[PDB]
Amino acid sequence: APVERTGLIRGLNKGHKTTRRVLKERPSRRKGAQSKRTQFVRSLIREVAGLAPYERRVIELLRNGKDKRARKFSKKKLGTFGRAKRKCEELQRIIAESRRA
Amino acid sequence: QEKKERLLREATAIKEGKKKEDVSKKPYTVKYGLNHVVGLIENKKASLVLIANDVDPIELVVFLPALCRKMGIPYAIIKGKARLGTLVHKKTAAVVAITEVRSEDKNELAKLISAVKEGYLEKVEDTRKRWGGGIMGFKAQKREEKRKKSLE
Amino acid sequence: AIKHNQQIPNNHFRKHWQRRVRCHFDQPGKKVTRRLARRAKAAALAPRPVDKLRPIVRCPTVKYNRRTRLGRGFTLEELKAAGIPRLLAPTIGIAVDHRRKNLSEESLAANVQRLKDYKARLILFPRKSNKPKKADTPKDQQTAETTTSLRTSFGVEQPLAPGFTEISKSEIPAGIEGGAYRALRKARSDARLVGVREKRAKEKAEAEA
Amino acid sequence: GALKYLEELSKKKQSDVVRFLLRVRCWEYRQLNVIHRASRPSRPDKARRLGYKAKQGYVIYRVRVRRGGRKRPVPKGATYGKPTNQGVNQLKYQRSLRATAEERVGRRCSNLRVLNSYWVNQDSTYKYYEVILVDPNHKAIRRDPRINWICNPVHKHRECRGLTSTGKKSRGLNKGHRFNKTRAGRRKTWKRHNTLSLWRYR
RNA sequence: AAAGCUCCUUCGACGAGUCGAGUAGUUUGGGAAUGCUGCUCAAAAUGGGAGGUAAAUUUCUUCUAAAGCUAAAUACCGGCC
RNA sequence: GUUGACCUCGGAUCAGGUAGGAGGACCCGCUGAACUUAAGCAUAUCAAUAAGCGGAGGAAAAGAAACCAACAGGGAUUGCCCUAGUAACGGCGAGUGAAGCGGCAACAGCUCAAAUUUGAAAGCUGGCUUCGGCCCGCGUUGUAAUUUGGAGAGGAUGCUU
Ligand SMILES: [Mg+2]
Ligand SMILES: [Mg+2]
Ligand SMILES: [Mg+2]
Ligand SMILES: [Mg+2]
Ligand SMILES: [Mg+2]
Ligand SMILES: [Mg+2]
Ligand SMILES: [Mg+2]
Ligand SMILES: [Mg+2]
Ligand SMILES: [Mg+2]
Ligand SMILES: [Mg+2]
Ligand SMILES: [Mg+2]
Ligand SMILES: [Mg+2]
Ligand SMILES: [Mg+2]
Ligand SMILES: [Mg+2]
Ligand SMILES: [Mg+2]
Ligand SMILES: [Mg+2]
Ligand SMILES: [Mg+2]
Ligand SMILES: [Mg+2]
Ligand SMILES: [Mg+2]
Ligand SMILES: [Mg+2]
Ligand SMILES: [Mg+2]
Ligand SMILES: [Mg+2]
Ligand SMILES: [Mg+2]
Ligand SMILES: [Mg+2]
Ligand SMILES: [Mg+2]
Ligand SMILES: [Mg+2]
Ligand SMILES: [Mg+2]
Ligand SMILES: [Mg+2]
Ligand SMILES: [Mg+2]
Ligand SMILES: [Mg+2]
Ligand SMILES: [Mg+2]
Ligand SMILES: [Mg+2]
Ligand SMILES: [Mg+2]
């Protein structure tokens, strides 16, 4: 039972009193989970293919450059700030690995 | 025909009541098929890999040298997709892997692996990293030669 | 052109509505056809009931929250608790819904008991009469008064809770301390002010450094 | 399997290797005919994913279609009506270039059933697709319950009736509030909403 | 041989010029943009979509797209009775 | 070196097949008006209609959630009643206008891609055959078996089919 309801409508924990059971996770909910082979295949394919032109531009703006410029450019390229920040984190990991290899 | 004969003798065996895989022994054969070979080198069972140099959609094999390097398995890009095919009784094979051999030619396998390593991989260790040439045509090459000779 | 005290007309007949008029002179004939189809399918399902067993389900919204009805099918958890195999349930007249979940022990237990009653009342004929298996009805309790309508014989016994109940005096519960109206006002105010109070509390906590 | 690697590689359309392959194959396809039989799928993973099988009765046809919007085919740009209908240039076709490619390939190979299609290349003036088709008269197809549903007459010219993937995309066939107008068919839903129902005992 | 159930450390592959974003046109009751399409940009891995007011941040809920088949209840007197 | 493989591309009144047209009331798409209403008229309305084009069947289409919801949660699709002339849209004018829940009719669930059968391509088309099989071809750039998230795979375990 996550949280027990107050038994009255119009409240912070409103709702009818039921003993809420915790249940095992359905296999659909695993969709975003990472796996060993997927990780292996994606890393090998990244090694084989390299970077995109916009990814190279972002990396150049990231190392010896401006993070606000990188953020703005990444958002312009990808369309969404969440995707832009995830891409910037991934390219930061790439830069760190390349520089500390 | 060999498979039919083996199945026939296994049939006589289990008609006599002797269990299967008693008349026949463990087979040692070369491994083919792209997905099968990829799985073998992923599980490190492959001892040597030969990749055809002329796979129409190179994509199917463009990652194979990198995969073999990552998994630490000796590979060689060999000439003849049709050659691998006729080796394996198909039209084409596009990839071939050898995992285990019999003891009478384990020494031959070791010799082949060492020779392939030191005579292909060590020589291509550097040339595999550079871009394919932008070679011009015959007349363009002659024009550039004339230009350089006139300049000097 | 309005001329008197009229309700403003808004009759949506400015399209060619006559092109799509649907009369219903075939209502009795369609009813007859439906009855014939029902009789034919009941005859085809000769000893079996004409429908599948359905679970009890609570209607979603805050309206209809109070009422139960029949659902689509029983969940995997309900079938497992009742001991009925998943592949065996749909072949013996039980509807299965793989996408419904049991978030509450009350619904889970009610549906499990429903399934157990159905299994207790089930008569299972052997696949071959000359060699019955241990899971089939052994030819002696195979004769009984059966039902052909699970929607009536296994309906919703009481969709609504009983609206009237008597308790003795001195068992009357004590009211909420400030009163029910005040309690509702307080709960509403707390829900309104949860975020502002949270940000103010964290601001005052962090003001020291 | 190598098809997972192929799937991952096909995502990297901006990489050097994929860009080089795309450029060269675009040149080759432009040199070839507008519609032509392809011996094998150039994207084996994509074809297998969309339902292609490597057995007799499965055919791949490559087609390129002209790119851009749909200019209104009126003489001298003169639409004869109200100003809201005077647009000529920036109008858009309601179906996809993929749908046009499938329709033309189906007309070329009437004897086959269009199973699916996929993008293979792009160009300034052309878009290139490979269409998977199935032979409904081949015995290898007619004997396979996994595919022989396409042998039934109700599946004649799926690409013409919008029953392929691109047709199901254009027609708005998805569940939810965002597809209220097109869930069950736009014209059918409109007829339902505009039908006046009169019962006997009104 | 094949098949179901009861428990389990572990593993658990899941559709890309696709989603999404911008812009243009059309359409919708869908209103800082409901669907569709053209062009440009162009993804990710507890990720992704949606949660009817545009945005950043933090949670929660719900499903699992970009492959496919499938009676019935429904329309229709065009055809044959 | 030539032949011989395989890769594309062709010839043939080669062997065997298939498509066209009709019908189009209903059905699935595309394309697409104006009369009219607004007491004028351009957005709007008529109308996502008529006309035009392509494609099916006895039904078609849709369909087993990247759904609805916000609840004590529902649970593929379709249709009727209601929601509701409502939310909303609209020179916010004329006018237009759904959906969830709820009752009912009818109910049905499924299979592929993504895994090595690798101790044996186990798969399939065509021809011949006494019926046991044989041959060619397709196919390893993957045809069978297994698996589809409701899981499953791997192990245990004793019953059951
Ligand atoms: Mg009129
Ligand atoms: Mg072929
Ligand atoms: Mg004119
Ligand atoms: Mg107008
Ligand atoms: Mg009346
Ligand atoms: Mg999927
Ligand atoms: Mg898109
Ligand atoms: Mg969107
Ligand atoms: Mg757009
Ligand atoms: Mg627009
Ligand atoms: Mg239009
Ligand atoms: Mg719009
Ligand atoms: Mg909201
Ligand atoms: Mg699909
Ligand atoms: Mg689907
Ligand atoms: Mg369908
Ligand atoms: Mg002939
Ligand atoms: Mg002919
Ligand atoms: Mg015709
Ligand atoms: Mg007027
Ligand atoms: Mg007038
Ligand atoms: Mg006038
Ligand atoms: Mg309209
Ligand atoms: Mg018409
Ligand atoms: Mg019918
Ligand atoms: Mg159908
Ligand atoms: Mg599903
Ligand atoms: Mg739910
Ligand atoms: Mg429903
Ligand atoms: Mg609008
Ligand atoms: Mg309208
Ligand atoms: Mg209902
Ligand atoms: Mg035969």
| Residue D125 approaches strand E within 7 Å at CB | no
| Residue D125 approaches strand F within 7 Å at CB | no
Sign of CA dihedral A3, A4, A10, A11: negative
Answer whether C120's CB lies under 8 Å from C84's CB.
Answer: no
Tell me the C-alpha distance between D134 and D24, whole Å.
Answer: 28
- Please report, for chain B, how many H helices and E strands are present, in that order: 8, 4
Cβ-based contacts of A27 with chain C (< 8 Å): none
CB-side neighbour CA atoms (13 Å) of C11: 6
DSSP letter, residue B120: I
Residue pairs between chains A and C whose CB atoms are closer than 8 Å:
38
Residue recorded with tokens 């075939």:
C26
Answer whether D8's CB lies under 8 Å from A41's CB.
Answer: yes
Query: Which nucleotide is the nearest neighbour of B86, by CA and C1'?
Result: F5
Q: Is A15 helix (H, G, I), strand (E, B) or coil?
A: coil
Q: Is C165 helix (H, G, I), strand (E, B) or coil?
A: coil
**Paired strand residues for C189:** none
Amino acid letter, residue B59: E
Answer whether A40's CB lies under 8 Å from D6's CB.
Answer: no
Tell me the C-alpha distance between B29 and B48, whole Å.
Answer: 13
Chain CA centroid to CA A61, Å: 21
Total length of chain C: 209
How close, in Å, is residue C33 to chain D by CA atoms?
18
Tell me the C-alpha distance between B19 and C196, whole Å.
Answer: 80
Answer whether C21's CB lies under 8 Å from D198's CB.
Answer: yes
Q: Which of D50, D61, D60, D40 is nearest to D7 (CA)?
A: D50
Greatest alpha-carbon pair distance for chain D in Å reads 74
Residue A87: CB atoms within 10 A of its CB come to 20
Greatest alpha-carbon pair distance for chain C in Å reads 88
**Phi, psi angle pair for C22, to nearest 5°:** -115, 95
| Residue A29 approaches strand E within 7 Å at CB | yes
Tell me the C-alpha distance between C94 and C71, whole Å.
Answer: 12
Instruction: Report strand pairing: B48-52 vs B95-98.
Output: antiparallel
Contact D8 A42 (CB under 8 A): yes
CB-side neighbour CA atoms (13 Å) of D95: 17
- Helix pair angle (A36-49, D16-31), 10° resolution: 70
DSSP letter, residue B48: E
CA distance between the termini of chain C = 74
**Phi, psi angle pair for C94, to nearest 5°:** -110, 125
Tell me the C-alpha distance between C115 and C122, whole Å.
Answer: 10
Q: Which of D99, D169, D87 is nearest to D107 (CA)?
A: D99
Q: Is A73 helix (H, G, I), strand (E, B) or coil?
A: helix
Cα D195 to middle of ligand 31, angstroms: 14
Tell me the C-alpha distance between D182 and D184, whole Å.
Answer: 6
Q: Which two tokens stand for residue D185?
A: 């068919």
Tell me the C-alpha distance between C169 and C15, whole Å.
Answer: 67
Q: Is C95 exposed, middle or buried (0-12, 13-18, 19+ CB in 10 A)?
A: middle
Tell me the C-alpha distance between C194 and B43, whole Å.
Answer: 56
Cβ-based contacts of A44 with chain D (< 8 Å): 5
Residue B63 in contact with partner chain A when CB distance is under 8 A = yes
Cα D188 to middle of ligand 5, angstroms: 28
Tell me the C-alpha distance between B98 and B48, whole Å.
Answer: 5
Q: Which of C121, C97, C113, C137 is nearest to C49 (CA)?
A: C121
Answer whether B87's CB lies under 8 Å from B93's CB.
Answer: yes
Cα D69 to middle of ligand 9, angstroms: 12
Tell me the C-alpha distance between D53 and D132, whole Å.
Answer: 9
* Entry resolution (Å): 2.2
Residue recorded with tokens 């090694």:
A47
Instruction: Report strand pairing: D196-198 vs B31-32.
Output: unpaired
Cβ-based contacts of D197 with chain C (< 8 Å): 22, 24
* Residue among A6, A14, A17, A19 with most chain C CBs within 10 A, to mutate: A19
Q: ∠ at Cα D61 (D60, D67), nearest 5°?
A: 135
Residue D84 marked as a ligand binder:
yes
Tell me the C-alpha distance between D183 and D161, whole Å.
Answer: 16
Q: Is D35 exposed, middle or buried (0-12, 13-18, 19+ CB in 10 A)?
A: middle
Tell me the C-alpha distance between D92 and D76, whole Å.
Answer: 19
Question: What ranges make up the beta strands (E) of chain C?
Answer: 21-23, 56-58, 68-70
Tell me the C-alpha distance between D21 and C73, whole Å.
Answer: 52
Tell me the C-alpha distance between B96 and C184, whole Å.
Answer: 77
Interatomic CA–C1' length for residue C96 and nucleotide F108, angstroms: 11
Q: List, in order, residues 6 or more apart from C122 with CB less than 8 Å away.
A: C92, C93
| Residue A10 approaches strand F within 7 Å at CB | no
Q: Is C148 helix (H, G, I), strand (E, B) or coil?
A: coil
Q: List, in order, residues 6 or more apart from C155 with CB less than 8 Å away.
A: C70
